[PDB]
Design a protein around this nucleic acid. Structure first.
Lengths: 145, 125, 206, 119
RNA sequence: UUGACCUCAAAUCAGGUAGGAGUACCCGCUGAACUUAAGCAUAUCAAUAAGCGGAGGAAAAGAAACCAACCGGGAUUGCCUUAGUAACGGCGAGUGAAGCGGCAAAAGCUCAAAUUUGAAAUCUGGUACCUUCGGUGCCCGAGUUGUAAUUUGGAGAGGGCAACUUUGGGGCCGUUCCUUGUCUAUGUUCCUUGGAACAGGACGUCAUAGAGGGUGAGAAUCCCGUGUGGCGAGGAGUGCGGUUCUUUGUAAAGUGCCUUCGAAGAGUCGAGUUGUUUGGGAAUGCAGCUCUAAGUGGGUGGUAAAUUCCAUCUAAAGCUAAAUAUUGGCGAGAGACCGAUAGCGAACAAGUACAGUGAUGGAAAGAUGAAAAGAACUUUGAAAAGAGAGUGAAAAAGUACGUGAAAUUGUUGAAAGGGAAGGGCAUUUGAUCAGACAUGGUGUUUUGUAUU
RNA sequence: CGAAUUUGGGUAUAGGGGCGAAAGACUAAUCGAACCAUCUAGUAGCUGGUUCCUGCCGAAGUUUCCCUCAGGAUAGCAGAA
RNA sequence: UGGAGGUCAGUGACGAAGCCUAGACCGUAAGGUCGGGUCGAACGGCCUCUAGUGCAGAUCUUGGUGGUAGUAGCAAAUAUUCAAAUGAGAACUUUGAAGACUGAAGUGGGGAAAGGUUCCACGUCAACAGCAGUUGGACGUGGGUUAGUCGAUCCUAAGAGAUGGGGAAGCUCCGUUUCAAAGGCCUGAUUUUAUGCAGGCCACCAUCGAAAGGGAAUCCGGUUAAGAUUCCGGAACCUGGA
RNA sequence: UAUCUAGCGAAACCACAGCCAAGGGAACGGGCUUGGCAGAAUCAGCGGGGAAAGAAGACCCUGUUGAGCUUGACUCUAGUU
RNA sequence: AAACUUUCAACAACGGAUCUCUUGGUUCUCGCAUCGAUGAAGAACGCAGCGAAAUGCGAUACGUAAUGUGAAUUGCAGAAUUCCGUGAAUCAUCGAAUCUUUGAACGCACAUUGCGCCCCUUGGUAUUCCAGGGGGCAUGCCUGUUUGAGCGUCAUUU
């Protein structure tokens, strides 16, 4: 059972593990299905940017303190500072976080400036217009890195 | 060379569809474009296939033999033609099977539903 | 997973003058009392049944791939390796054969075959045409009925009908310079693929 | 040859019932003759003829009741849409699309605005 | 005396719903042992098998009584990673997560508890009508022990102060789209072999079609089909330029400043104990029992307990697509898979036959030939059949049918043999057989003189 | 061999259960715990088997420890690089 | 050895693969090549890839086949024989003549359970009837089972088992009258009328469980290839019904 | 009955087989060594031998393999108190 | 010398290996969401000119109707210039129907083709008996409707 100089191993295969084995054969298949779903989804919202404008955010722990990343949604403080309402923003693709707070000015300004950069670079069609199609971009994240 | 994902190049599935064919796959389309006497003279081409056509056997041991289709044996995947028969040993004469693909249609058996395809295609004769 | 185990066979034990292999119970069938479950048994389970979690794809270092690709492109310009692959380049005026990028915009298959005869590469076509033969073995009814040689590899910078014009040309493969598969550049790990470059594809290599 | 349904649909109840009786008489007569002779395929289309007459008779009777209950709820279950038990129990298009007045005033005020990013 | 109300009942009262099936995946309950530990009891197997209840195309989960401790993230799910790690374990055998990070997909919310009280504004059903997935009358009702409007913690409500937006269901052109139809390229030209050309050779054509299949052998061109496009039929679709069908009446919601307030879920939380479970270890979850709260309260902050803070969220109520699962169903496309003792048990009238009272058990069995042309006819025989004959490219294909091995058997014929046979080296005898002075002095005297 | 008799059909009792004038008897040729399927390809230090050729090298049954004594680990002996 | 990539523009219906061959050659060998025969559609060499890759054994698996061996044997139940006919064919089939046996708790005549068409007729003998077969419970094709009275049905028996209700996570378990709001027939009425409306008695509590228990009522004679207490001819009975 | 005949027609078993004596050998050989010898094909019997066949000894031991049964064995447990 | 084991450029057997074939399986991937009290899944019995099985179907029974295509089906037959057409077909569709006995299975019962009750008819010159045709009669619930019950209770005192 135990023999010559080898590392002691822990291979957890004493249950009926062979019944719960998943081979990801559909890696290529899932990727194709995902790109199709992205393709069809973008068509249905044809002018819209296929994503919500996400905010900038500092990563939690002391390990990732140095990094800043894309969060969930804009704080209601940030949205009011821009000049909008959460009900309106959720309709023009600016994701809003009610649980988030701002306890830090640089995140506050960087998110507000992100908002003004969004407004100046997007055009909202009136509900009774002529729909002047405006060369949709599929990524709001790539539009505002 | 095949492109669409709806067409299968599976030999197993193809012969299964061939032998278990309904009229959608019950041979070719069974209606199919004709021989050169009608094709080369006019140019306005096509007309469907029927029983009482006349044909010329262009291949086989009965090659170069003429007659009328006595029956289109769809189940047996062959057409029977009168005057091309096997003489049995007892004097009986049984009709010999023959595949339409080894035939050319020499004289058609016309009807309205043929002349509908002429209008549908745009022919003038 | 259940092949050969869909039975309730049990061993008779010793004392009955038969092998201790499990046997089907019951009676009145012919199957009753017959050996089961064993890789030595007719109708039993095979030894170490094949599994889907066998390793199928094998990872190759990215850099080694591009190393082998560069070796395959480099061996393209070597005449000796291209003849040794059997690529009928005796009538080709020079190798690497590079054509003007008009062939990149050819449209009909007639002028794809016309271009091959003009650059001298059509001898590779007659090779593929006459090297069609039935595959020996059971691969015939696994949708692999025929085998043939490979022809020249036409490499282009832009697709302006080149792929369509050459699609129905047997053995001829087309490829964009961006990809340049090793699977086509060294077919069967044999170096020296006959490549016909368009001018623009050639200059993109730098 | 065999009677045609498109013909029978022009005939009234008494004509069809009379047409049915002498067909059943023809079938009954044919079954007697089935014993004397080995084969008689005529019995098949007579059964088809009997079936054709009954098909149209049931069709007028079912159609007669259909506009008898027309325009009012509670048609007979045999007349109702068969589609499927779960589809039959599913919420209607009107009922599934119902919203509260609270939701209605929010949907009106802020619908999903159509826009696009330019640069 | 006569009417109610509450509770309870009855009717083949008027109209409905549930039950079973399948169950691959999914949500729960219930629940082993073999096994491993080289014994075995905790452990492990396994919170598995078996058992029971309940769904959908997904289910569950889900918009924090969260994670954190940071310069903070911000519903849920899933993948990569964290990680065989923290941790649990006769600390043995073994077991074993989560936060962060990257990504896929991302969507939000709504009830209870509020001060309509100048008007129950609310809803089912019955009848009536209509343009029937419903609208409008009217009526009986239900309902104030509370049905509407309004608010949901991200807020909100009352009151005082402004120059701000929207009045459309299914159509029809059309549009991922669902089910489908139809039209759209080129040799069967000539010689050889053969029964059959679909083989060999010569000469062509088309190719955005040289996939696949069929046809009497290996067929882009005999056909489809394939490839490109074209023209049509019906359908859950407001996404839009319009809608044969008004162009809505003294209303809907959003924002700024200032005052007052601002309900927020109980035999529940929480505590003890027990059992079980977990990596959760002075107790991770759950459950039984006992105890039983509160409002700057409560929960959480992974070592039990006072005291002081701090950081976070807001339970005991509720809905929600996507990414995620799927050995079942339906429909498709494939493979370095198997090839009839293989592959599913079943390629075939296979869960058929057969066995067992029953639960249940459960096979074997694919190939004439291109076509049946399935052997007409004559003679022997009671007949089966034989011998001819005939069909076939082949009866060395006759249905006891492609090929037709071996064992075993009748056994061209040869040989050997006094209680086995077979074997090794060697020769002899018998039988049988491969290999050799065929063109190279004359550069050639005969020999069908460039055939030497 | 007129009875604690023999016996048909109906009915009841079902597996650690039944039934037993008691033999561990009987419970469908199964009984000191039936039969069927599944867990389950249960585990086996034990028995048997383990499929081509040639070339080169070539052992051990000894040490220590082990509920070790028909087994392992360890060292030795051997091959290969 | 099976399959895969590449190549030999390899072999092949003018014959691939397979198989047989005390024919040849090569290799120490694993094996390779070839002559001859058989055969009919595919298959090889070389460079590589890959694996369900090599058998004499496992009381191995499945299948097939020997020696034993024309052997053991085909001897319980007293027993057969003669002739004819039918048939190629008779020890065994039919007919006659004998001889025997069951000897009325039968080798007789009926039934129950079970079987399921074996019944009966006609053709018929490949297989089955451990010899035989012209015969048959065999084979093929058909015919046949006639009820108010014979049974079931009805009744209850040991006992099964719903509801009411109570357990049980639950498949389900108990429970059978229990702590339940468990009930017809006469001129009531007797002309929007059949319950628009004062006409009594209750103290019923499901249902299933016997083809031998209890029960309404049928006999004789005749009839068929096979049915009969059922058909037919006579002669009766019982129950219900104005 | 056996026997012989006509029909019908198995099985067990079987590495190969089947004459001895001694020897030596896994210490009782059909085979090996040395001798004796040894002549086709066979039939009915027969029970000396084939350490005959029938069954992976049921006795005995070993296994860190069981089970039935019993108890002040260890660990629990329905019930009961 | 025969008769009696071995080898066959040998034939014939036995047997079914090998080879080649494959309308099957297996595995992978992709898309979809639809069983049943409007009676499902499943079972039994039947149904064809000539069917036993198998497929399909339900006494309208290998099938009716509606639709498309446009001459079959085919083992043998059999209505046929049914064929220039509201039209063949073991054809495809498939929306309208039929859909026996059952089964969650529903009047009660069920090893019975058992036994009832209500409504409308027809007949036997009959509200009650019998027969025939057609309709019906399960539980648990929910919402509503009528009829009630209870000194539970309110008005309300002949």
């Amino acid at each position: 059972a135990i023999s010559k100089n080898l590392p002691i191993l822990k291979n957890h295969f004493r249950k009926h593990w062979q019944e719960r084995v998943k081979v990801h054969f559909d890696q290529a298949g899932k990727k194709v299905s995902r790109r199709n779903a992205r393709a069809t989804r973008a068509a249905k919202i044809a002018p819209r940017p296929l994503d919500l404008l996400r905010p900038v955010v500092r990563a939690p722990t002391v390990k990732y303190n140095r990094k800043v990343r894309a969060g969930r949604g804009f704080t209601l403080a940030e949205v009011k500072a821009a000049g909008l309402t959460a009900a309106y923003a959720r309709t023009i693709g600016i994701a809003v976080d009610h649980r988030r707070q701002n306890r830090n000015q640089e995140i506050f300004d960087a998110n507000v400036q992100r908002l003004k950069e969004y407004q100046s670079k997007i055009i909202v069609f009136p509900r009774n217009g002529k729909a002047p199609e405006a060369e949709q971009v599929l990524s709001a994240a790539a539009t505002f890195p | 060379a095949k492109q669409s994902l709806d067409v299968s190049s599976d030999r197993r599935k193809a012969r299964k569809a061939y032998f278990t064919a309904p009229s959608s796959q019950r041979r070719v389309l069974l209606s199919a474009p004709l021989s050169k006497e009608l094709r080369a003279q006019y140019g306005i081409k096509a007309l469907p296939i029927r029983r009482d056509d006349e044909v010329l056997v262009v291949r086989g041991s009965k090659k170069g033999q003429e007659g009328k289709i006595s029956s289109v044996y769809r189940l047996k995947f062959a057409v029977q033609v009168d005057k091309v028969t096997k003489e049995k040993v007892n004097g009986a004469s049984v009709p010999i099977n023959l595949h339409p693909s080894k035939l050319v249609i020499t004289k058609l058996h016309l009807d309205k539903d043929r002349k509908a395809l002429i209008q549908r295609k745009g022919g003038k004769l | 997973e259940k092949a050969g185990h869909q039975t309730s066979a049990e061993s008779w034990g010793t004392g009955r003058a038969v092998a201790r292999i499990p046997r089907v119970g019951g009676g009145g069938t012919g199957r009753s009392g017959q050996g089961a479950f064993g890789n030595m048994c007719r109708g039993g389970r095979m030894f170490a049944p094949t599994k889907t979690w066998r390793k199928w794809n094998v990872k190759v270092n990215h850099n080694e791939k591009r190393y082998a690709t560069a070796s395959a492109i480099a061996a393209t310009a070597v005449a000796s390796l291209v003849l040794a692959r059997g690529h009928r380049v005796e009538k080709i005026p020079e190798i690497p054969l590079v054509v003007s990028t008009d062939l990149e915009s050819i449209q009909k298959t007639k002028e794809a075959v016309a271009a091959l005869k003009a650059v001298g590469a059509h001898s590779d076509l007659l090779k593929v045409l006459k090297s069609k033969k039935l595959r020996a073995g059971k691969g015939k009814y696994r949708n692999r009925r025929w085998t043939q040689r490979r022809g020249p590899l036409v490499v282009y910078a832009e697709d302006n009908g080149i792929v369509k014009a050459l699609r129905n040309v047997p053995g001829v493969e087309t490829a964009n310079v961006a990809s340049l598969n090793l699977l086509q550049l060294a077919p069967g790990a044999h170096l020296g693929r006959f490549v016909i470059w368009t001018e623009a594809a050639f200059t993109k290599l730098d | 040859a065999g009677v045609k349904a498109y013909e029978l649909r022009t005939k009234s109840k008494e004509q069809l019932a009379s047409q049915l009786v002498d067909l059943k008489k023809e079938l009954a007569e044919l079954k007697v003759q089935k014993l004397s002779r080995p084969s008689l395929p005529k019995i098949k289309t007579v059964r088809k003829s009997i079936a054709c007459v009954l098909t149209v008779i049931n069709e007028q009777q079912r159609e007669a009741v259909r506009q008898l209950y027309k325009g009012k709820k509670y048609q007979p279950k045999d007349l109702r849409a068969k589609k499927t038990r779960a589809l039959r129990r599913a919420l209607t298009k009107f009922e599934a699309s119902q919203v509260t007045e609270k939701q209605r005033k929010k949907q009106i005020a802020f619908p999903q605005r159509k826009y696009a990013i330019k640069a």
